[PDB]
Curated annotation (Swiss-Prot), chain B:
Recorded disease: Muscular dystrophy, congenital hearing loss, and ovarian insufficiency syndrome: An autosomal recessive disorder characterized by early-onset progressive muscle weakness, sensorineural hearing loss, and primary amenorrhea due to ovarian insufficiency. Some patients become wheelchair-bound by the second decade, whereas others have a milder phenotype and maintain independent ambulation into adulthood. Most patients have respiratory insufficiency.
One GO cellular component term: cytoplasm
Chain sites annotated for binding dimethylallyl diphosphate: 71, 149-150, 183, 205
Annotated EC: 2.5.1.-, 2.5.1.1, 2.5.1.29, 2.5.1.10
Top-tier EC class: transferase
Binding-site residues for Mg(2+) 1, renumbered to this chain: 62, 66
GO biological process: farnesyl diphosphate biosynthetic process; geranyl diphosphate biosynthetic process; geranylgeranyl diphosphate biosynthetic process; isoprenoid biosynthetic process; isoprenoid metabolic process
Protein name: Geranylgeranyl pyrophosphate synthase
Chain positions recorded as Mg(2+) 2 binding sites: 62, 66
Effect upon mutating residue 16 to S: In MDHLO; uncertain significance; shows no change in farnesyltranstransferase activity
Positions with a binding annotation for isopentenyl diphosphate: 26, 55, 72
SUPFAM superfamilies named among the record's database cross-references: Terpenoid synthases
Organism: Homo sapiens (Human)
Length: 286, 267
């Protein structure tokens, strides 16, 4: 009886997923699933399949935030400590990477040859995104609004696209959604950026949790050479300086613009009341 | 100006990977197994590259995870490029490897890559688990972890080559034996070199001689005192023997025996 194996197997799986679970236990998953279902209104995909897609998509999302936190050197997330301050860097890297490959295992269960091709590209896309973020930081600068957007579409907005890409593989709906997907990607991220600041006498780096954020970008470019982001970064009571230059204003407008661009591109794809409810629910904070 | 900056970032992401490859000091090996597996060169080359890619990506992450200061005498990658870059290079490379495994155009090859990478992540799992709890594996737990890390990559490379062979005889037994053989051999080498604490010379890494010491100031002298070098020399002899045995079983392999002989010289 070598049950000492089974024990160490059961043990290691638990540990491997603890950082991942510390992040799932924050508020979140609720909305990213009202989304899938909504899109399925066009793509009419079987239920077993949609669940697997949603799980995979949620797996990558969370594992990526674990890493973003380490890379941006964040102290908090949604008010709590970041996972690596509690579990340590090693264990968190190990956990996030382990989840990516479990995401892979899981994609395989879809049992459709293009699924891995699609997964693989997204994962490469995502890391390139992280790369950009570290690049701007190594050069003591800050992206433009246009460059920020592009980074979002690659990172943790890009991921919808995988979700809907994989769904499409199981649908006869073959009209092109990439456009509407970009639009929602930017809309979710920027909403979030907005929400998180519009939320001490705190400085800007501290509120953004060391992350590039739409309102703080715009503010930095708005009063060849690099950007000297230290003034809008260590500017006391940010949630004012940001009222002052009017970035909260600009952002609200930017979101209103995208809200509307969505409703346009949605009608172009036939209409989808399920999703329009979801947009208008989501708009109500501006 | 977004597409230029995009390409530049893909050249950048590979820099920590290449730092590690350029370090001074597995390819007699691949051909040696190819003796049984009669693999198409083109497919072989792809397997070799995937294996190398995955192997060094994983060394990058191990060095972060073990907080190692050196590797073969050189500063570890993250001490030069920083943790964010290294995490970010190694993971990019792992998925470049998956991309490359897809060019094999065999559906079980993704199946296998996944299993092996899962197995590997569980191995580092235990490694970090033990370090985080102020503890040390016993001999059997160490042997087992090693088999999960290197049996992970070894097994991957031999598993892939076997998908492209009509040689279907079971090779895991020999691979476990070699997997232990190389690790423990390396542990023995690293330390036997000696003219000074132990987590320092092992470089954050759990090591066979030390582990055996631990379950009975200066480290190289302490291991002499308890006869760990002694014990490990025996343990390696037992392993070499066992390998010669498991090779005869599989039809023999002059090239592989020649290699095991070259490696054993130092014990
Ligand atoms: O069934 P086979 O012995 O031809 C196969 N070997 C191969 N399968 C495949 C393969 C490719 C796509 C789908 C299924 C098998 N390709 C190749 S190329 C050289 C060998 C080989 P397996 O992996 O089951 O031993």
């Amino acid at each position: 009886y070598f049950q000492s194996m089974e024990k160490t197997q059961e043990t290691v799986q638990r540990i491997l997923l603890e950082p991942y679970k510390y992040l799932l236990q924050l508020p979140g998953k609720q909305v990213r699933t009202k989304l899938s279902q909504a899109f399925n209104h066009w793509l009419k995909v079987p239920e077993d399949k949609l669940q697997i897609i949603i799980e995979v998509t949620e797996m990558l999302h969370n594992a990526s935030l674990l890493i973003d936190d380490i890379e941006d050197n964040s102290k908090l997330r949604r008010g709590f400590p970041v996972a690596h301050s509690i579990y340590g860097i090693p264990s968190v890297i190990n956990s996030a990477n382990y989840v990516y490959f479990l995401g892979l295992e899981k994609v395989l269960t879809l049992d459709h040859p293009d699924a891995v091709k699609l997964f693989t590209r997204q994962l490469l896309e995502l890391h390139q995104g992280q790369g950009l973020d570290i690049y701007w930081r190594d050069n003591y600068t800050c992206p433009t609004e246009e460059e920020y957007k592009a980074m979002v579409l690659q990172k943790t907005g890009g991921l919808f696209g995988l979700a809907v890409g994989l769904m499409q593989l199981f649908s006869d709906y073959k009209e092109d959604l990439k456009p509407l997907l970009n639009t929602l990607g930017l809309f979710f991220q920027i909403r979030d950026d907005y929400a998180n600041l519009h939320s001490n006498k705190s400085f800007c780096e501290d509120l953004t949790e060391g992350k590039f954020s739409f309102p703080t970008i715009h503010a930095i470019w708005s009063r060849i050479l690099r950007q000297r982001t230290e003034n809008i970064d260590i500017k006391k009571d940010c949630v004012h300086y940001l009222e002052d230059v009017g970035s909260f204003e600009y952002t609200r407008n930017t979101l209103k613009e995208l809200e509307a661009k969505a409703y346009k591109q949605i009608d172009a794809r036939g209409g989808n009341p399920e999703l329009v409810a979801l947009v208008k629910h989501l708009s109500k904070m501006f």
